[PDB]
């Protein structure tokens, strides 16, 4: 189809390559991000091909700023290049405006770079779906960006493998007045629903944005939530 | 042309699926390796009556298969 | 389409509420319905039906009746048949609002 | 006189006994096709256009 | 809870479970969930049947539904249906199991849905209605096929599958293998009911006329 | 669901009052008048109070009568408005309300005539069957057999046009009920068996009572293999019998040849058979038939046996069972004869060939007499 070239339109008006990128998305790692009354919780699985893979060596939740946490859909190396760009962009905004980058604005710049990669005839977009949690002016924000350059705001959402079940889960297993603890419980529950196989401190990692600051969970805390609970 | 022809193949398959007349007791069954693909138009419930999974044999099932052949 | 050639055009838009009612009644005429069936609600719960998918929904209700060896259909059968024939169970999240708006 | 009255190896000569115990799949397909191929007239008196298609999915062999 | 249960002081629990309710409200709802699950498990598991078996469960259903702890109430009701099945009360067991299935169908909580359908199949088998038990077992089978089954859940499901496949006398080898998997799972979680499976295991081999 | 008009619980209580052993019972006055005043059957209460020794509930009877008159007045004015100003659907609803209340007040002639006019002017076939079902319920409530038969054939004729499945299913239960009312247990058992899993006639009576009727009629009507395949192995039947051990024992004892327990259960079940507002007129017959069937079962596996053996098996004494076999053999219901000197029953059941010959010769006369009467078409 009209996918071998990125800079041309199909007769129906679709640029097939970017929905191919979105098909690469949701085939990767499952992950779920929800917005609670106070904070924002992003959870992702850590399950490798073999037990030799020391998973703590490769974090997936990355703090862009002390107030921003970032998770991806599963496209590892593309996520790494994009997260480097996002970190540098956040630094530029932090120094230019002398204020920390807004979550929505940070997602806007990241999606702008994403769109910049959605042109020309000799490059390809990063097939990564990005979940961004942040705190701005006392308000919590959860945003999702996609390789097409578009971005949106979600109270709760999920992407990766078996994402439709996560969507239904956050449809009926959610209310906007969730406390932080119950928010992490909802996140690990939808992770259990979406994932295949059990989890321990090894198999999940979670980042939580609270208005004081963001922090990625230690694996011990990840087991505390996932195991002996739910 | 190959792409257009495979699309016509799919459309003719659906037309025959809906087109085989009543009082004909033909059954049509399709095998697949992935099933996460496959056009939902073919997965339309008006012509799909059951979707049966055949995952890799695990414990018990592997034991049963080995016993049966052996 | 050039004038001296084929002369008339006809549009076949997706069936509306009344059309969905008529298709439901027509195809379920042969079906063994049960008191308490309210086909109007099923028609309302199926916006943007394609007409043929209404035949699909009645066939699905009949299939639910069959797999339980029942020769009769109820409102509940059609209601959970809607859940399968809604056809956006594989949709509503192929990223439509994005990159197309 | 009037006398009193299959294409290939299509007849496979394999039984459920030879099957490696896919019991759940056995039941699923048996309801899916075997009853329709045996008793489609009852599913006709239901009026539902008795079954036409089922999907087989899994790893290759 | 553990010390008051294992020592047989469960008669005092009738106050303790009521003493901690505001405490359960103050702390996170899921922490209260874990504590309530542990307390009810430790209570019902022993011989402490003393005039409060289904009563405390009843007012805790009321407490959870009033506090909008709906999911805690459905889990508690699944435990209550299990108790009802144990108490040979299969009629009301069917009633609560059915309505629990309806609400669980309002949501998409397959994890408890498989257990509820499993209990439905068990109580249908207890009432000699083999077809309904088979249908419930098949529904639970697909629902569990959706997710990865924990060893406890997998063992229970396979034990019931073997029981049902034995209730039909047309074949025992598949029932034998199902009991084998159930026993393997139970031994893996070291649950006592393993011996029960181990019994049914041998039963099949006696039924296969190959002792 | 279908409306409970007329209410057959009222008929059951009235029939119970028709029995002298229960006319002195005060266990009915609490509930029957509870519904009697609610449904306001002025004609039926008037018939009752001048027939079963009970008398006027002054305020209840006054509210009864006056509410019936004023309700009929408003129904009449609404029907008149509908017929003068509204289409056939609104008049349909108006006369539905009129006939429904007229049956509600148990006015046999009034309900009959109102449902009659409503049926005559019915718009379409869908409403035709339902009126027949109301009138069948009224006929059963008064136990008017001729009305029941005519309504049954009317429903048959109207379903003949291709009525939908719901009316067809309900007609099976109604027709089986009719067959029970007319000692036709052979067809009643098959009708009840066909709808045991599809029974939805709550307006008549509950499901457990239906399965009791089913097991009652099946044992008398069906032979042992059919009893095994369609009742013993009928999953829903055992499912409901787990809640009803009393009839489960009565069935299993006959099937498992536990004849003494079977006789105890049959003696018990004869009481409910008698109290039953529909099963009473045939009750003795039913109680009789099982006996021979029971005997016919026990004598099946023996060529000869001492009377003491069956006496102990049925938990009865030698003289009683001897008299029972005397009657039943005298009636020709058993193929055995008694050597009272040694006190031994001895079967004389014909073999397959001998039975075949006896049926051949019997049907031979039943056909040859028909031919002979058909003869003399020569020389009129």
UniProtKB/Swiss-Prot annotation, chain C:
Cysteine-cysteine disulfides: none
Q: Which domain of life is it from?
A: Eukaryota
Where in or outside the cell is it found? Cytoplasm; Nucleus
Q: What does this protein do?
A: Component of the 26S proteasome, a multiprotein complex involved in the ATP-dependent degradation of ubiquitinated proteins. This complex plays a key role in the maintenance of protein homeostasis by removing misfolded or damaged proteins, which could impair cellular functions, and by removing proteins whose functions are no longer required. Therefore, the proteasome participates in numerous cellular processes, including cell cycle progression, apoptosis, or DNA damage repair.
How does the record describe its quaternary structure?
A: Component of the 19S proteasome regulatory particle complex. The 26S proteasome consists of a 20S core particle (CP) and two 19S regulatory subunits (RP). The regulatory particle is made of a lid composed of 9 subunits, a base containing 6 ATPases including PSMC5 and few additional components. Component of a complex with USP49 and RUVBL1. Interacts with PRPF19. Interacts with TRIM5. Interacts with NDC80. Interacts with PAAF1. Interacts, in vitro, with the thyroid hormone receptor (in a thyroid hormone T3-dependent manner) and with retinoid X receptor (RXR). Interacts with ERCC6.
User: What's this protein's family per the entry?
Assistant: Belongs to the AAA ATPase family.
- How is this protein named in the record? 26S proteasome regulatory subunit 8
Name the species this protein comes from: Homo sapiens (Human)
Q: What is the lineage of its organism?
A: Eukaryota, Metazoa, Chordata, Craniata, Vertebrata
| Gene that specifies this protein | PSMC5
UniProtKB/Swiss-Prot annotation, chain D:
Q: Where in the cell is it found?
A: Cytoplasm; Nucleus
Q: Its family? A: Belongs to the AAA ATPase family.
Query: What is its quaternary makeup?
Result: Component of the 19S proteasome regulatory particle complex. The 26S proteasome consists of a 20S core particle (CP) and two 19S regulatory subunits (RP). The regulatory particle is made of a lid composed of 9 subunits, a base containing 6 ATPases including PSMC4 and few additional components. Interacts with NR1I3. Interacts with PAAF1. Interacts with TRIM5. Interacts with ZFAND1.
Q: What does this protein do?
A: Component of the 26S proteasome, a multiprotein complex involved in the ATP-dependent degradation of ubiquitinated proteins. This complex plays a key role in the maintenance of protein homeostasis by removing misfolded or damaged proteins, which could impair cellular functions, and by removing proteins whose functions are no longer required. Therefore, the proteasome participates in numerous cellular processes, including cell cycle progression, apoptosis, or DNA damage repair.
**Protein name per the record:** 26S proteasome regulatory subunit 6B
What lineage, starting at the top, does this entry show? Eukaryota, Metazoa, Chordata, Craniata, Vertebrata
Curated annotation (Swiss-Prot), chain E:
This molecule's function is given as:
Component of the 26S proteasome, a multiprotein complex involved in the ATP-dependent degradation of ubiquitinated proteins. This complex plays a key role in the maintenance of protein homeostasis by removing misfolded or damaged proteins, which could impair cellular functions, and by removing proteins whose functions are no longer required. Therefore, the proteasome participates in numerous cellular processes, including cell cycle progression, apoptosis, or DNA damage repair. In the complex, PSMD11 is required for proteasome assembly.
Q: What induces it?
A: By FOXO4; expression in embryonic stem cells (ESCs) is mediated by FOXO4.
Q: How does it assemble?
A: Component of the 19S proteasome regulatory particle complex. The 26S proteasome consists of a 20S core particle (CP) and two 19S regulatory subunits (RP). The regulatory particle is made of a lid composed of 9 subunits including PSMD11, a base containing 6 ATPases and few additional components.
Return the protein name: 26S proteasome non-ATPase regulatory subunit 11
The protein's location, in the record's own words, is: Nucleus; Cytoplasm, Cytosol
Which family, according to UniProt?
Belongs to the proteasome subunit S9 family.
Please give the Gene Ontology molecular function terms for this protein.
Answer: structural molecule activity
Q: What GO biological process terms are annotated to this protein in UniProt?
A: proteasome assembly; proteasome-mediated ubiquitin-dependent protein catabolic process; stem cell differentiation; ubiquitin-dependent protein catabolic process
Among its keywords, does the record have Ribosomal protein? Answer: no
Q: What is its main location?
A: nucleus
Included range, full protein = 54 to 264 of 422
From Swiss-Prot, chain F:
Record keywords, A-Z: Proteasome
Q: Which residues form the PCI domain?
A: 184-352
* InterPro entries linked: PCI_dom, Rpn7/CSN1, Rpn7_N, RPN7_PSMD6_C, TPR-like_helical_dom_sf, WH_DNA-bd_sf
Provide the GO biological process annotations: proteasome-mediated ubiquitin-dependent protein catabolic process
- Keyword Kinase in annotation: no
- From which domain of life does this come? Eukaryota
UniProt similarity note: Belongs to the proteasome subunit S10 family.
Instruction: Summarize the protein's role.
Output: Component of the 26S proteasome, a multiprotein complex involved in the ATP-dependent degradation of ubiquitinated proteins. This complex plays a key role in the maintenance of protein homeostasis by removing misfolded or damaged proteins, which could impair cellular functions, and by removing proteins whose functions are no longer required. Therefore, the proteasome participates in numerous cellular processes, including cell cycle progression, apoptosis, or DNA damage repair.
Instruction: List, alphabetically, the PANTHER family matched.
Output: 26S PROTEASOME NON-ATPASE REGULATORY SUBUNIT 6, 26S PROTESOME SUBUNIT 6
Subunit and interaction comment: Component of the 19S proteasome regulatory particle complex. The 26S proteasome consists of a 20S core particle (CP) and two 19S regulatory subunits (RP). The regulatory particle is made of a lid composed of 9 subunits including PSMD6, a base containing 6 ATPases and few additional components.
- What protein am I looking at? 26S proteasome non-ATPase regulatory subunit 6
